[PDB]
Amino acid sequence: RRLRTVGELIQNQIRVGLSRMERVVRERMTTQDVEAITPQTLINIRPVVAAIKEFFGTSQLSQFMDQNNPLSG
Amino acid sequence: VLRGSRLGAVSYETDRNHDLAPRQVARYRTDNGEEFDVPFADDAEIPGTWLCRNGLEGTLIEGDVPEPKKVKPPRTHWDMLLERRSVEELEELLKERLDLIKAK
Amino acid sequence: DSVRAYLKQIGKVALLNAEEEVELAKRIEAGLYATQKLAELAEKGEKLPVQQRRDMQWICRDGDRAKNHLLEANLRLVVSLAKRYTGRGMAFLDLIQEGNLGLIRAVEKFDYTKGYKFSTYATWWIRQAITRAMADQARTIRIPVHMVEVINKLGRIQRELLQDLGREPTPEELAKEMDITPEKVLEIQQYAREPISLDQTIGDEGDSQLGDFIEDSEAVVAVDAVSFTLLQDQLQSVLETLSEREAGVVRLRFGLTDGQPRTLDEIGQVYGVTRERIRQIESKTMSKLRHPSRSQVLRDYLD
DNA sequence: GCTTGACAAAAGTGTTAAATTGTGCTATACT
């Protein structure tokens, strides 16, 4: 049994968001002018930001800080 | 935690049958033969046709003929064909098709 | 999914060649003309010979069968279009079925003299039928077609502007492109919002659903319900403290006796005095009641 | 204690200008 730390938990959602971004980019690169396209004009960052927002907001692991006292936190 | 309401509001008034609104009942009959009653106020102006429980627009029994309620006729497949083919062309079409079945 | 039965059943009829479509359409037209001839000629007698009668009835049946066959062979077209619009809110198979109803209209209007394929014309009718179907039936709270179109236009513009700016635009930014006021687009956005499901679970577990904890604003508050009645008694006791001569005017003026307020003139229908005198009597009674000797009895019921 | 003359504010009555809603049709070819 291993331990997913915070870093790996965030990395998984980053990977999911970038996978959605990859699907969008590979779909849309077939339908744009060739040799005149620019990387900044087809890289869509919305899905990764949405995944990051969802993780910190709704994920069961991202819990409210327990500030009852220093030991609790 | 969160609140809402129905599409209406409540009224606290109390009175009961001691106030009577003068009303009379009209009688209607539908296509399938079922009959129904509808209480209306004495202001009347009762309509000649009424949508009853069963869903058939029944007619009143008192009058011999109700309000005509005439409506425009429907538009059908021939009537729209006639907007693109002349009767002279349809005659030739009929002649042409009769030629083949007559061949046997 | 169980739409496979429809796909199989429509798969037993082969596609038409370019020359069969004209034949089928011409047969349909000829059969329609034959049916209309048999219908019309009956209005004045004009018996036709038995052989011609049978041949014309055969023409009618052949036209009907050709129309049916033309629909059958082209049912396969509708699914290829319906698969494009699936997932927007209405069921895939419903999309197919109601696009078929545009397909019958396309067959009704299609003609060969234009020298064009059946698909070229039928595609437009199928597409508009599917569009109208989705517009009418895609939402629990119905939105008229023009409103749906303006909502779609707003969504289209907002998507591009968000892709450009990188964030959700302020209403005025969308207004600058819609040529309408920012509050107008803000209202359209409110019209666009879908209702949520009242049966959705709440509490991160299957303990209860959202509906179980909605507090009703228009509830029957007990303390008010009784309180009103007390007033309806207390007020009466004050009105009963007057002479019936004075009490009747107020009871009729505000409709206490029967719930319908009465104008100054109508109170004279039983009292006989003129409307101005009824106003003077009302003023006298109204000043007598507001005097502290009777106000304190029921003042604090207003809240 | 009450009628009458006379007046203005409020509200019905109808027209119609504007806003909203429903409906048929778009013909390269596409199954």
From Swiss-Prot, chain A:
Outcome (variant: D66V): Rifampicin (Rif) resistant
Outcome of mutating Q63 to K/L: Rifampicin (Rif) resistant
Entry's family note: Belongs to the RNA polymerase beta chain family.
Note: Mutations in the RRDR sequence (residues 423-449) confer rifampicin (Rif) resistance. Rif blocks transcription initiation but not elongation.
Protein function: DNA-dependent RNA polymerase catalyzes the transcription of DNA into RNA using the four ribonucleoside triphosphates as substrates. This subunit often mutates to generate rifampicin (Rif) resistance. Interaction with RbpA partially restores Rif-inhibited transcription; once the subunit is Rif-resistant however RbpA no longer stimulates transcription.
Subunit structure as annotated in this protein's UniProt entry: The RNAP catalytic core consists of 2 alpha, 1 beta, 1 beta' and 1 omega subunit. When a sigma factor is associated with the core the holoenzyme is formed, which can initiate transcription. Interacts with RbpA, which partially restores Rif-inhibited transcription.
Entry protein name: DNA-directed RNA polymerase subunit beta
Upper classification of the organism: Bacteria, Bacillati, Actinomycetota, Actinomycetes, Mycobacteriales
Swiss-Prot record, chain B:
Organism (species): Mycolicibacterium smegmatis (strain ATCC 700084 / mc(2)155)
A GO molecular function held by the record: bacterial-type RNA polymerase core enzyme binding
Stated role: Binds to RNA polymerase (RNAP), probably stimulating transcriptions from principal, but not alternative sigma factor promoters. Partially restores transcription in the presence of rifampicin (Rif) in vitro; overexpression leads to an increase in the Rif tolerance in vivo, with smaller colonies. Seems to act by removing Rif from its binding site and preventing its further binding. No longer stimulates transcription in Rif-resistant RNA polymerase (with mutations in rpoB).
Subunit structure: Monomer. Forms a complex with the RNAP catalytic core, specifically with the beta subunit (RpoB); its binding site may overlap with that of Rif. May bind free principal sigma factors.
Matching InterPro entries: RbpA_sf, RNApol-bd_RbpA
Protein name: RNA polymerase-binding protein RbpA
Biological process per Gene Ontology, one example term: response to antibiotic
Entry similarity comment: Belongs to the RNA polymerase-binding protein RbpA family.
HAMAP family: RbpA
Keyword Membrane: no
Keyword vocabulary terms for this entry: Antibiotic resistance, Transcription, Transcription regulation
Gene induction: Constitutively expressed during growth, increases slightly in stationary phase (at protein level).
